[PDB]
Amino acid sequence: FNGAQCKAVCVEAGMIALRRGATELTHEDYMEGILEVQAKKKANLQYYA
Amino acid sequence: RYDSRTTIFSPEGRLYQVEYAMEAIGHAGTCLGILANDGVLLAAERRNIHKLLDEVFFSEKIYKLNEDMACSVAGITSDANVLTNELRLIAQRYLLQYQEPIPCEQLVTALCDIKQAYTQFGGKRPFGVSLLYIGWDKHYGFQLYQSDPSGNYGGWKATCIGNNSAAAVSMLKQDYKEGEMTLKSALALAIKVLNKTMDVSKLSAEKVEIATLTRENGKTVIRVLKQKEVEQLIKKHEEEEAKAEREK
Amino acid sequence: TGYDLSASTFSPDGRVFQVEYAMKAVENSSTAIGIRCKDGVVFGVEKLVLSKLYEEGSNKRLFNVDRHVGMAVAGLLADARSLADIAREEASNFRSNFGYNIPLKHLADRVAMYVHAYTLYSAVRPFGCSFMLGSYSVNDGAQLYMIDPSGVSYGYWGCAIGKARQAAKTEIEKLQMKEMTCRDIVKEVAKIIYIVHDEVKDKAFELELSWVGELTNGRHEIVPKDIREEAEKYAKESLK
Amino acid sequence: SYDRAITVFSPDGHLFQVEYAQEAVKKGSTAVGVRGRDIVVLGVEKKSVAKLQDERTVRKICALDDNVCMAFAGLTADARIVINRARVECQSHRLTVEDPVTVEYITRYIASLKQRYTQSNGRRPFGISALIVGFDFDGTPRLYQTDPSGTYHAWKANAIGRGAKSVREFLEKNYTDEAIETDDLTIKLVIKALLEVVQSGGKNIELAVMRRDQSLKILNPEEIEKYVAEIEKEKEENE
Amino acid sequence: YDRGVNTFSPEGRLFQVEYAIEAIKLGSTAIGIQTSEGVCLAVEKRITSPLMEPSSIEKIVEIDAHIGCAMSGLIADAKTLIDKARVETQNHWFTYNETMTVESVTQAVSNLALQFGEEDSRPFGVALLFGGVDEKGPQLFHMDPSGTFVQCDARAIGSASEGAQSSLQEVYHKSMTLKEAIKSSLIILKQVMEEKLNATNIELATVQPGQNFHMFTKEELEEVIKDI
Amino acid sequence: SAGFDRHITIFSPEGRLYQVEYAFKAINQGGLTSVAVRGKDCAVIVTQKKVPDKLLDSSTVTHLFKITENIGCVMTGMTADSRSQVQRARYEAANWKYKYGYEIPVDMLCKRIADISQVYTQNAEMRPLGCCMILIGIDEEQGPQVYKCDPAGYYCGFKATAAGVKQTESTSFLEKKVKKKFDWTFEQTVETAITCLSTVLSIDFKPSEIEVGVVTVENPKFRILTEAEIDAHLVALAE
Amino acid sequence: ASGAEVKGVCTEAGMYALRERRVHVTQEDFEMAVAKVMQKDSEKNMSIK
Amino acid sequence: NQYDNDVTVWSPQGRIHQIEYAMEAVKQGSATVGLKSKTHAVLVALKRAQSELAAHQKKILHVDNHIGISIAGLTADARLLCNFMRQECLDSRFVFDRPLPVSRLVSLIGSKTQIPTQRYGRRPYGVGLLIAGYDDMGPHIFQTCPSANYFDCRAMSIGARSQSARTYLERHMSEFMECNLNELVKHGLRALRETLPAEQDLTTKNVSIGIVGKDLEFTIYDDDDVSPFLEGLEERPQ
Amino acid sequence: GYSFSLTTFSPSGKLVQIEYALAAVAGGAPSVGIKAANGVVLATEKKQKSILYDERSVHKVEPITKHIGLVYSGMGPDYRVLVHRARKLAQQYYLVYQEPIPTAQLVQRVASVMQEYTQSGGVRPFGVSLLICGWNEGRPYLFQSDPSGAYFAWKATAMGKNYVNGKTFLEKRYNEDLELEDAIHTAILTLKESFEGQMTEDNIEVGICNEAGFRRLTPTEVKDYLAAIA
């Protein structure tokens, strides 16, 4: 990743914590921030058994 | 757009190389054969009438192929040699197999299949050559046929070559004959056709070529006739032109 | 350039870019050197572990074609394996048809013609390999050869194939090559491999040393490098 | 993806030359064919006699055996080669198992040859579609058609060439149950098909029959004039 | 670009096989369901003309006395594959005095379902459903143009296969019975078809271990239709 | 012009083809100079080496290739084409010796090599061997011969001969030099070869750079000169 | 010929008359002008066809 | 980009992009992990399906009494190399009447796959073999590539997202060598459970395990000797 | 960018990779051949590029048999290949019939060879037009072929640079009835008309065809004749 993709991880983790909206950041907030910044979704899959 | 090879189709479904082979046919020598019983004729126009030749071949478009058949030709000239050697070989194979002269129709279809196998297969140049057929058989008598680069073949009684002969076919329809098997009449008709259709002023005999095929008692000889009777044929046709200007 | 596609076409200045692109492909491969002494030929290859996934003894670029001839390849590995098989096949045919060991010049010429024929046609590419050929004979001495991707095959005393091709032969030529036995040349090749690229671009490398000559009685094999352990006790003294 | 070549698909899953080679058939001469109960009959249109030559060589209806009958559309040369091959196939089948050749086996041969001819490398497919009529098994009338892809497809009546949708649409409004036999009504059915043809010139009609046991019979342009006369009589009686 | 079978993609893949999978979609649908009582199977004919004789168009063919088939896509590639299977089954019985089991049939077909090569032709354009009874009871088998063969319990193919699989997984479980699966299948057929369901539209093929012969239903299928 | 991008061997308009006349400077990618001299009953080859390296050998760098015991040659251009042409010449000379029972004349070998290059030129789909070959040889009843073989397949053969990179100038000097009718008593030939290369290159260098190939009618064996006698000739021409 | 080639024939025959210091146009001026325009088409060993 | 079409064409940087595209085609296969002890070599793969009703596509397939392979990539080339593999086994089994050393077999695989990477007219094989065998010197775990540069390892893993598996192999390659079969196999699936997203669990029907031993013949298992191997696990540390 | 290559026709015209081969033939060295009453005389124009070249090595006038001369105007390396073909083929005729092959039959078979090479589509055609002559059955002949596979029969013709000018001179100067020596004279005249002027015993190379057989003349009789022949 670049620095901007880690920044996107940071901010999307903040608003993923704000989906709950109650408290400060958790580790799963960072995980789901990654899970948005990760892909480029594929999931294609076929012919490769 | 959809040019590149002979195969496969252009989306109509039309073709590319059959049309372009006919447009290769049109800029070549003009030939004809006529409605005649008890004989049949061929005419031909001399290409390259420059004075430094020899004419020691006696035959430039005509090829006396088996015994009782000749063929005019038009188009790319070396492919004509390629096809005529093979066609003589086909006829001579038939004679080897049966000891009977070839009855000309299966000969024509065999050559059409030879051309057609290069139409389907790829990537090969199809033969851009149309050529005529005169001959005699045991089943129909004197015959006339028109080979085409498509592999289609037409049984005619008055034949057709390209842009120099569309007007010839028009005169053949407008001056159609039937019932007269007299060969001199059809020779005068052919002289009139080459007089109008060829641009030769007053029809010099060095620019023409005439071959005939008559049935003589068992033999079916082919007459590549000489020049002096062509000269008096020219004088006869010009006397007929004087007969035509009697209406003035 | 453009004009660079097939291996049969020429350029408007007259060279083949397929040969050139095949040449500078081996430039990115690992460094492989060679040098002979007065009674033997020594090989040595800077070989790298990827990260932690290797086994130290796999896929060794030091081949061994004949009883006295083996390769020190560099470039595309599988192409080198195929070319090694062709070399083994040719040496087998010579042994079958003539009953004695193949001379190295004739072997090099046959392999060079094989390389050249794979440069000729358009359906195949030129090879992406550059290798060494060493040998020893009691009636012929030591001969050390060298084969480019094009097929120009001739002899050296010393060579280098890899990134530091110039930077190795910078100091290979200051070695007093004639008066030394190859047991000294072992730690010589050790210091030559060890000086170039200790830790700079990559993390770790590993040393192999092939070894043919009078001491092996015509045999060609890898050294017992662990025996007498010539690199590291000299490598730790070659950093100063 | 393109009209070249025959080997690659479209991005939406088509073959261009398979779809395009049928257009040469679809711009071709019209030839219909029906089955009676006992006598089967068919014919081509557009004889197109050009006033100065013979037309016994341009016959588009032939036979491979005494039990099977032919027709085609598209271009004539592919039909020539396919029929010349099919005669030898029929005779090789006769050289094998001594039955009269079933229509189904020879249609499988022709369509199979056409298909494995198409699958190969750069061979221009035969732009024809044949009509293969026979009555073999106790005189059971059968007629199959072909395709440039090479799919035999059994019908009861058939119409190809120019304007085949309209000509087949006439048989939709014509072909009731009690057609045949009633051979005379099958005769008038062929006559009504020829009257429903795209030009129906009256003299350019050429039709050939088979009574499932006899030979191929080429008719005469005076019987057909009587058929057109009685068809016009039926049209006047409709008034 | 993608222009030929001898070139990968920057991400994958063929890009000829993909267009063959796309060329599955044009065909008429067919549904088979594996039941331990026996394999039932169905198809749509998509008749165009009344002149088009309905029993002439083949969809279920008979490879072995206990092995059926169904085709989906180009007819003649399917005919070639059926021809080869008809040869190979007989060779297996020849060399072994026994029935080639249906998985081994499908391995034999998928050996050259992809042997496509023009030098050293094109890949085939049909997906096939195989139903049969080996020693392990009935078997229902689903292959593809790409040779990636797997077993399926109730597979649907061709056009409108998405909602067919959807409503199929809606109704299916492991312990179905025969006639229930038959009517459950033909419900999905008359939900995905456009014409009125009658005796000429569909055809069934039922194989049972005690009813190995005659994997077909002829005009009792009318009676099965009229029960809905 | 091009235009046609001259990829394969076809005819370009007016009227030439470009592949072979691009191969004419595949010699010029060699970076080398070759000179052949025929004046009297000896014949002299001279060609430098380009060895910058002390790690590179000296014996294996020779471009004088002994074809047969009475035929030697010299090569320029790229080395792989040269060595391949040399093994082909060796093999075909051996085939001559097997088939015809005697030693081949030098002309027939040049004809055969030219035919091989033309066949590689006539048919496409193979790279047409960008190396030039110069032959020498003694024949009975004809004295010495020099021949040149092209990559183009145009063999020719003549008295004062040169090919490589810088031989427009060498042929100019030999036009200005072989016009006076002097005899050539073999040190005249050595002196003219060394000085013509020493005027083209203008280096006046050590005996370790040029290789000298000679053949003489006193011993028809092809002969490669040694460092000592090259130095002897070099200081013998040093005035 | 074309239409405007015959005009060129006539005018350059007049040129052929004036280069011989004349204003009258003989037949030999046309004999040279026909050869002047003749370079439009020549060139055989191309009969083929 | 007009030079990135065919196998024969060298790049102007010298990198055949057909090879790297074949590598990326290999990377879209299933996860699988191979690892050996001193006495026992175990390769474990992952199954997938087309649908819920559909069966799972097998990955580990039998080859010989002491050789079994994993696979990732194409299936036609997989069965093609399977047929070639079995042929190369039974040929020397017929001639020499011995089981093969594994190394010369995989060299034969490389020489087999070299020609479709150099000439024109055949694509390179998208292939993901992990080969376990027993010569006289014990177990071997080899891996392949479409570039025919076969690699010998002690523990590898190829397919999609196999990097976490590789790091697990890094942190337990010291530990693999001494243990017996059971915890070796559960180390293998403690690589495969990190080849997955953590919001689902490795079930029965999706896995297969193949053990060949120095005294044990190569055997594939599915759910039934695997439900004994699936016990003895903890959850992932959420 | 079309035709390209040898497998398709043009949209309306002819074959471009035959027309360009004829263009390369017309861009070849000049030559002339004259059929007289008793013999046929062939002669070429052979200038060395430098003064280094030798004139006893390569030979333009080349016999095919002891009574058949043959020259060209084009490219030597293809010329030798087709000549060697004609040699082997004439020897096959002499194997079969035990009789010296007639020149028309040579032209048939050589024309078939060249037309086979113009067949599609992997090789180029020759850049070679031929001039075949010989004194077969008393009457001598003169046969010119072309890369398209066709052939002709001339009284006198020319091939190379300024062949149109040589043809106008042969139309003007030559006629039907001459001797061998008079044909030699007008042949050297029409060769010197378009060549460079520095013409010696070596720049030309002349072969004749008597009824006594083919004869390839020497520079001795050439400098005996061409020492200011007019």
Tell me the C-alpha distance between B226 and B207, whole Å: 13
Q: Which residues have CB under 8 Å from F149's CB, separation 6+?
A: F110, F113, F114, F117, F132, F133, F134, F135, F155
Indicate yes or no: CB of C10 within 8 angstroms of CB of F130.
Answer: yes
The CATH number assigned to the domain holding C174 equals: 3.60.20.10
Tally of CB atoms within 10 A around A5: 12
Tell me the C-alpha distance between E219 and E199, whole Å: 7
Residue C134 burial (C-beta neighbours within 10 Å; 0-12, 13-18, 19+):
buried
Q: Which residues have CB under 8 Å from D72's CB, separation 6+?
A: D31, D60, D79, D82, D83, D128, D129, D130, D131
Q: Are D79 and D28 in contact (CB under 8 A)?
A: no
Tell me the C-alpha distance between H223 and H47, whole Å: 12
Chains with at least 3 CB pairs less than 8 angstroms from chain B: D, G, I
Nearest CA in chain B to I11: B20
> Tokens for D71?
């027709």
Name residue C107's amino acid. Answer: L
Helices (H), B127-244: 166-174, 183-197, 228-244
* Domain residue limits at C202: 1-240
Q: Are D102 and D46 in contact (CB under 8 A)?
A: no
Domain locations along chain E: 1-228
**How many domains, in total, are found in chain H?**
1
* Paired residues of I18 in beta bridges: none
Indicate yes or no: CB of H48 within 8 angstroms of CB of A45.
Answer: yes
Buried b (16+ CB within 10 A) or exposed e, E9-46: eeebbbbbbbbbbbbbbebbbbbbbbbebbbbbbbbbb
Q: How many CB pairs under 8 A join D and E?
A: 71
The superfamily in CATH containing domain F1-239 is Aminohydrolase, N-terminal nucleophile (Ntn) domain (3.60.20.10)
Tell me the C-alpha distance between H66 and H217, whole Å: 6
Residue with tokens 């001797």: I179
Q: Are D151 and D18 in contact (CB under 8 A)?
A: no
* Paired residues of C75 in beta bridges: C129
Indicate yes or no: CB of B76 within 8 angstroms of CB of G47.
Answer: no
Task: State yes or no: cis peptide before A40, omega within 30 of 0.
Answer: yes
Calculate the CA E127 to chain-centre distance.
7
Indicate yes or no: CB of G46 within 8 angstroms of CB of I22.
Answer: yes
> Tokens for I214?
């083919």
DSSP secondary structure letter of residue H100: P
Chains with at least 3 CB pairs less than 8 angstroms from chain I: B, F, G
* Domain residue limits at H173: 1-238
Residue I14 burial (C-beta neighbours within 10 Å; 0-12, 13-18, 19+):
middle
Report residue F4: phi and psi, to 5°: -80, 0
Tally of CB atoms within 10 A around D224: 20
Gap from H50 CA to chain C (nearest CA, Å): 33
Residue with tokens 């035709």: I3
* Paired residues of D133 in beta bridges: D69, D143
Name residue D111's amino acid. Answer: A
Tell me the C-alpha distance between F5 and E212, whole Å: 69
In sequence order, what DSSP letters do the residues of chain D get, joined into one string?
A: --SS-SSSPPTTS--HHHHHHHHHHHTS--EEEE--SS-EEEEE------SSB--TT------SSSSEE----S-HHHHHHHHHHHHHHHHHHHHSS-SPPPHHHHHHHHHHHHHHHHSSSSPPP-----EEEEE-TTS-EEEEE--SS---EEESEEEESTTHHHHHHHHHTT--STTSS-HHHHHHHHHHHHHTSSS--SSS-EEEEE-SSS--EE--TTHHHHHHHHHHHHHHHH-
**How many domains, in total, are found in chain C?**
1
Tally of CB atoms within 10 A around F210: 22
Name the residue facing A45 among H28, H71, H75 (closest C-beta). Answer: H28
Nearest to D4 by CA among F126, H237, E171, B16: B16
In sequence order, what DSSP letters do the residues of C67-135 get, joined into one string?
A: SS-EEB-EE-HHHHHHHHHHHHHHHHHHHHHHSSPPPHHHHHHHHHHHHHHHHH-SSSPPP-EEEEEEE
Q: Touching check for I148 and chain G: CB below 8 Å?
A: yes
**What order of strands is seen across the sheet that includes strand B31-32?**
B31-32, B40-45, B208-213, B222-224
From the CB coordinates, do chains D and C have 3 or more pairs under 8 Å?
no
Q: Are C61 and C77 in contact (CB under 8 A)?
A: yes
Q: Which residue of D4, D8, D132 is the best one to mutate when testing the E interface, meaning the one whose CB has the most E CBs within 10 A?
A: D8
Nearest to F194 by CA among F42, F44, F49: F44
Indicate yes or no: CB of A49 within 8 angstroms of CB of E148.
Answer: yes
Indicate yes or no: CB of C125 within 8 angstroms of CB of H114.
Answer: no
In sequence order, what DSSP letters do the residues of chain F get, joined into one string?
A: -TTSTT-SS-PPSSS--SSHHHHTTTTTTS--EEEEEESSSEEEEEEE-----SSB-SSTT--EEE-SSSEEEEE-S-HHHHHHHHHHHHHHHHHHHHHHSSPPPHHHHHHHHHHHHHHHHHB-SS------EEEEEEETTTEEEEEEE-SSS--B--SEEEEESSHHHHHHHHHHHTTS-----SHHHHHHHHHHHHHHS-----TTSEEEEEEETTEEEEEE--HHHHHHHHHHS--
Q: How many CB pairs under 8 A join E and H?
A: 74
Write out F90-114 in H/E/C secondary structure: HHHHHHHHHHHCCCCCHHHHHHHHH
Tell me the C-alpha distance between H220 and H211, whole Å: 7
Which CATH topology does D1-239 take?
Glutamine Phosphoribosylpyrophosphate, subunit 1, domain 1 (3.60.20)
Resolution value (Å, 1 decimal) = 4.2
Q: Which residues have CB under 8 Å from D93's CB, separation 6+?
A: D101, D105, D106
Residue with tokens 């559960």: H186
Half-sphere exposure of H223 (CA within 13 A, CB side): 7
Report residue C222: phi and psi, to 5°: -70, 145
Tell me the C-alpha distance between C65 and C107, whole Å: 11
Q: Touching check for I59 and chain G: CB below 8 Å?
A: no
Name residue I192's amino acid. Answer: K
Tell me the C-alpha distance between F70 and F105, whole Å: 9
Query: Measuring CA to CA, how many Å separate C138 from each of C65, C70, C143, H154?
Result: 19, 17, 12, 42
In sequence order, what DSSP letters do the residues of D132-193 get, joined into one string?
A: EEEE-TTS-EEEEE--SS---EEESEEEESTTHHHHHHHHHTT--STTSS-HHHHHHHHHHH
The CATH number assigned to the domain holding H121 equals: 3.60.20.10
Which CATH topology does E1-228 take?
Glutamine Phosphoribosylpyrophosphate, subunit 1, domain 1 (3.60.20)
- Size (chain D), residues: 239
Indicate yes or no: CB of A44 within 8 angstroms of CB of E12.
Answer: yes
Indicate yes or no: CB of F55 within 8 angstroms of CB of C16.
Answer: no
Tell me the C-alpha distance between F164 and C162, whole Å: 32
Q: Touching check for H28 and chain E: CB below 8 Å?
A: yes
Domain locations along chain I: 1-230
Gap from B23 CA to chain G (nearest CA, Å): 11
Chain H residues with CB inside 8 Å of A44's CB?
A: 28
Query: Measuring CA to CA, how many Å separate B86 from each of B82, B111, B121, F87?
Result: 7, 9, 19, 43
User: Coil, strand, or helix at residue B1?
Assistant: coil
Which CATH class name applies to I1-230?
alpha beta
Q: Touching check for A45 and chain H: CB below 8 Å?
A: yes
Q: Touching check for H25 and chain A: CB below 8 Å?
A: yes
Indicate yes or no: CB of D4 within 8 angstroms of CB of B13.
Answer: no
Q: Which residue of E2, E3, E7, E8 is the best one to mutate when testing the H interface, meaning the one whose CB has the most H CBs within 10 A?
A: E8
Indicate yes or no: CB of F171 within 8 angstroms of CB of I23.
Answer: no
